[PDB]
Paper text:
To define the role of RdrA in phage defense, we used cryo-EM to determine a 2.5 Å structure of E. coli RdrA. The cryo-EM structure of RdrA reveals a heptameric assembly with two layers of interlocking protein domains. The top layer of the RdrA assembly contains seven N-terminal AAA+ ATPase domains with an active site formed between each pair of neighboring subunits. Extending from the N-terminal AAA+ domain, the RdrA C terminus is a largely α-helical lobe that interlocks around the assembly to form a flared bottom layer of the heptameric complex. In contrast to most closed-ring AAA+ proteins that form hexameric assemblies, RdrA is an atypical complex with 7 repeating subunits. RdrA also lacks a pre-sensor 1 beta-hairpin insertion common in many clades of AAA+ proteins, and instead contains two large insertions not associated with designated AAA+ clades. The first RdrA insertion occurs after strands β2 and β3 where a canonical single helix α2 is replaced with a four-helix bundle that forms a crown at the top of the heptameric complex (discussed further in Figure 4). The second RdrA insertion occurs after the sensor 1 motif and includes three helices between strands β4 and β5 that reach into the central channel of the heptamer. In contrast to the N-terminal AAA+ domain, the α-helical RdrA C terminus contains no detectable homology with other known structures. RdrA is an active ATPase in vitro that preferentially hydrolyzes ATP.
Numbering used by the authors:
A (entry chain A): 35 to 50, 69 to 76, 81 to 94, 102 to 140, 147 to 183, 190 to 395, 412 to 474
B (entry chain G): 35 to 50, 69 to 76, 81 to 94, 102 to 140, 147 to 183, 190 to 395, 412 to 519, 524 to 661, ...
C (entry chain F): 475 to 519, 524 to 661, 704 to 897, 910 to 934
Amino acid sequence: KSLRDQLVESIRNSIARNVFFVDGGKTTFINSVVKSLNVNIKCLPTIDPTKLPRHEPILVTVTARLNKMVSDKLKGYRKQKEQWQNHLAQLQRGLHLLTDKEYKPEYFSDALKLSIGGQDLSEIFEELVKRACEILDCKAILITFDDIDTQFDAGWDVLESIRKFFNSRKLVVVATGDLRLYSQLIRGKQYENYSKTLLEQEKESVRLAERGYMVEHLEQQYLLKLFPVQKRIQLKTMLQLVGEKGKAGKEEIKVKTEPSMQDIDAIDVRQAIGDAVREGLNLREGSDADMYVNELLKQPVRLLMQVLQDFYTKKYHATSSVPNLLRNALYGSMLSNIYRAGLNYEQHRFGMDSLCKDIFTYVKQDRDFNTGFYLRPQSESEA
Amino acid sequence: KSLRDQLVESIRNSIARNVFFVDGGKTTFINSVVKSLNVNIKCLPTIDPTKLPRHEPILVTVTARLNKMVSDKLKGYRKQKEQWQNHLAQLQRGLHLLTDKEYKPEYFSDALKLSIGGQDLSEIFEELVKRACEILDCKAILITFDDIDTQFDAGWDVLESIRKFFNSRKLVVVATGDLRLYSQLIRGKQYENYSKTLLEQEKESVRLAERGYMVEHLEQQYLLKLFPVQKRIQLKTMLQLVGEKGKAGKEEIKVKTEPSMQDIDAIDVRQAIGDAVREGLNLREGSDADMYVNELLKQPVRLLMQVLQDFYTKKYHATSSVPNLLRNALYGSMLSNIYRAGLNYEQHRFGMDSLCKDIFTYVKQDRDFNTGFYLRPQSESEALRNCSIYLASQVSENCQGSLSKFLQMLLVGCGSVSIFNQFVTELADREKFEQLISEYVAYMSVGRIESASHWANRCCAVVANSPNDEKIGVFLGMVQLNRKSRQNMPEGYKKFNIDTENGLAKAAMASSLSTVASNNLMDFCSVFNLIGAIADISACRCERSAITNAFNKVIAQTTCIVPPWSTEFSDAITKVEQWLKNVNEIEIGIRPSALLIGKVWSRFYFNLNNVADQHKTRLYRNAEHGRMASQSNAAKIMRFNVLAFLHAVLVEESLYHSVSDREYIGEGLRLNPVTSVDEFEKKIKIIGEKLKADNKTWKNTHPLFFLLISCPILHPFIFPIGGINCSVKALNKETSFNKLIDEIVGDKLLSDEEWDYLTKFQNTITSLNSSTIVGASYDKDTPAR
Amino acid sequence: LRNCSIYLASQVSENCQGSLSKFLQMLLVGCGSVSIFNQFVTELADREKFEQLISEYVAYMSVGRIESASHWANRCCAVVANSPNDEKIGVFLGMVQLNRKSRQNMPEGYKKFNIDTENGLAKAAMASSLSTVASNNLMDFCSVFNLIGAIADISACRCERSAITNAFNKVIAQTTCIVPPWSTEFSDAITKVEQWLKNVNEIEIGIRPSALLIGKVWSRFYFNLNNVADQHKTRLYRNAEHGRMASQSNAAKIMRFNVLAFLHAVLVEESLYHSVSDREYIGEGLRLNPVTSVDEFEKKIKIIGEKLKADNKTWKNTHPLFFLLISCPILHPFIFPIGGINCSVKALNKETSFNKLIDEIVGDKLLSDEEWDYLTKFQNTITSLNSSTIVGASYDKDTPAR
């Protein structure tokens, strides 16, 4: 992408917070960036916070990956090393601070032997990063964090590590995900600070209202802090990568419907969807088919991938009822949505007795009751 | 800053509680102070309570930093040292007191060996500070605490350490943050002291009330204690550092927009914001742009920094749509605010279907429902005030360069708020009120409209299930025409028939037809549906065939339900095809604001009720032919409803359209054409010959009015049969009203030989005059003399 | 709350200091936003319901987010106009609801209200008080609050003459608003407002009011207002027009005394509770309000008038706010309107001697004798409100004997 060139190239002249955020594929784009960086900038292997050991601070993972990169370099082609070890061991023995149930006085003696005073892990990690940058022939080390949609608790550890430890020039951070998720995490953590019995005592509408405005201000400032607006990345969607109604279509990509498809017969991408929709909905080429296609192009890119692939593979199947094929693909792809709405789960009673009741249920939650039986995709919500 | 000189200099002569508090950049100011101190006062490195190890008392961090400063000094240039060690070790071994789950007796023996008695950590730390002051050649050691906005639990440890340990001359404390946060912390800690089962037992309103007053007194005394009022620091805001309206501006600072900006080209700071706001909101230099800038200057200084930097860097980008740039910057900067309000998160469905629903949601939480569609930043709260400017940017970007989308904004968004107030609020508890809104959205199609005419069709039903006072079919902006020929008429009064109307007059007339299917399937001739029709043939396409079915959608009898709470057109199409091309070339040069669109609606909506009242009580048996100012019929009402639109657009667009720097309308007393065209004949005209002395046309300036006045759909309603006043006095305007219109449109509207019949037929309505209106008894005659 | 009271008193004292516009603001938006709620909105209201009624009353009233004082007064007209009873006359608290449809059979010369027959400043003063409320009938109210709101809006515009021009056009223009969700030709007048605004500008800076003064000025004003709403209510006879007497009242006399009720309220409390002078010049006397005649107003000005001289003081240094208000061209047409002047041998001795005292304060002489003579049997004087019919007014009996 030219947008990944964006991210690389602004990162390049961003060192001559320092955190770049990407909305949203996220994983594929992050990996592309990691590569395009290989004017030197080191890049740690992408960290997936949802796949790490559970109770393991992000600082531990970052330091371990940095240790492997530094030792792999140090190995080829000793004076430098034990003084990398020095900071590694001292960072270690200073790492009880993150994990302890409480403070015990034996840790005072640990804080009085000797550039600020004490055992502040921020300083030790920043010298560790200075170590790594001197050793690796690099200035800044790109700590890149992967999306957290699966389990967004780990996002809090990521945010705290970014705030407290990765705040340094020798580090540039690229995080990705959905900013609503981080909003949620931060707001919940901000509510955590209010004292218990205060919350159970002051329960007038004014108190909840002002505490809401207040957790507002705090969460907003937190996010403007860790994720500067100027450093946030697009990651457009599909409909933006293709034409709207024929008056657009920057960098069309094409999809492949058949096995042979010698990179010339590939029937577009807007087409594949239009053709599935027109065949399986029996809709003609009116503005209504382009309608359904437009809505379906706005989908999470995986959902479109899976529906469009199931349909066409089973279609090859059928040719060694298209609406049956599209219906099966849509049932599987939108399965969580229909199971939300209370529509019929079973395939063995699709028939049409359950179809009418499904439409009535959909109309009931879509309200409407006037154009709802059209089944046009106009509703409040994705589901 | 001179204010940091303040803090340093009062601290300097404050030692010759002792805690200085700073409201709120806090971090930058604190660091500046730490420096300005380097008459000696030692200063510990600034402590950030949110970045310390978790379970670590503030005393530990303070003592460690003091130990490093003392040992770094002690190193250069032994008798003193082991007696610093003595206090360090004894403070240590006396530090189990802060951390223990409980007391164990082995600690008694620790408290009996030997200036007060025991192992009180306060004394040991105060001697440690005396140690450090003797060693370092200083009197007082500035323990400076950094802001805690991130995680304000640590503020409690800070407060307790200040109260119990840093209370000493050899220590001066500078804390910073927001005093509401510390209020919260202290109040919660005070409630902590009340016994459990007491709290679960005494739960009368009096008990909670007195315990509230009581935690009041305690928290207040705590804060007056730890943070003396005389020692609290300003830390002004941005708007105070710059001018209010040009009558201020102490120590202006300037921002830099471009990379080169050789420390002279820096275009101010108030300017950068004013220029972003005026470009991305399309707001002109009126008091409204300085408005938005004033509100945005009051923001947390980081938010302004980030929005103002994103906008201008991406602007450099664009020059190797400004409203798109400002909208993106505002969306990112105010992201938490909009995500609070429940507005659309996604960028991939910004469009304008979600824009109208966003405005309705904002108005719902801003209450108002009367000026809310203005999107002015006036709300209770920071969150909705931010959302207002973000939505203004959304409107400016989405409506830019589109006459269809302008009418959309105007109708769906603003009307979706006005209609609700005056015709749906009479029903509505909060649970019930929102659900009434929920259907009003669902029925109105707000957020999911197909077409503007569809909204207007549904608007007819909503408006038509409330009015009273003799039950006439003369509603807000419409006339309910009789469709059953079962009523005994005086004179030539009879039904309405679409077949006797011809060509464009029929097409214009049929666009306004609206059928509502409650139980009687009436038919309304409504101005909204005509406006909705115009929106639907404004962005179809270059085709002539596409215009054809665009007609057939709005021309055809459109029938809808009341809410759940009560060949022959050949030349007209070329003409609409004509005017659409005319719109297409030159609609792209239109940058409206939520202010302009809201104010055009305000005039239009107001002018509408004057027509709904003045012309209501003038439906006589001979009032037809509308020859006079005090005779009205179904044709005169509709003509002035159409004229009310065009006048509203002309006036506000002469005032609030960012295509021209100034008004061509003049400083005058501004009225609406209700029963005659005095005011409309006027303003066009006074603008008409000013444009020439200014060497301007109706094209370059006043685009929207020019496109609307030139619409063939509107022309039949402008000079209908029986809607033209025929007095010697009244004609001098109306004949001179015609000329001005022709001169703008570029083609001459009615032939004299068509003009003569009017004042003594295609493209002119000839059957609405004698169409009877429901409830109009039509039994009385016009007054004489 | 006791601490909050003194804090808010300090807020009022600081913010209203040196500003006649902000003084009227405090007075109207703040204090009125409380009284109006009591007497016209409490009849509806549970605590959950009560606060929500307040929440809309704030939201509709624009309390906390007002654009202009006239906007508040326009919304105040609707709130006041959805409760009164007892024969359903259009004589409300501080206002008159004028008929706008000429469909009613009149005795005598009674007819509509028309703004076109009024001229120059009289028109401008009259049109400022026009208020339209759009519930279902779009009536028109001539309200003292909107006139006070108008004065506030042309008190802090600026030094310009053009800025005053559109300041007029905002308050002059037909202002139309909804009921709450719970029911060329002005050339010389502008120079004059431009005149009086400069007069205000030099010397408004020397005005330091208190929550006590502002609250007490409102208390007198608000009280005087209901005496006018009752004494003049039951005096609308067919021949009560020309207002020649104390027991004959019309739409012009009611409004004049509503304006006089304001000016008297300011004069009295400001003689008592304004920190610009150490003492009162009003005297230890029994203190009444001008309701049906100007006995009390002719009085206090005067007793203050010649005390100021023995004390070597002027209406400038002492009693600033009253001096600025009495000198406002906007108010003058309502002071001596046609049919609002009592024409009894007894009653005139005050009113002719009421005129002199006013001229001597303002510094310019208000009406020419040859304008004064027509009054006591025309620009800068209201001549069309006398014969303007009021809704509900019987207008059938003329001064019922005994």
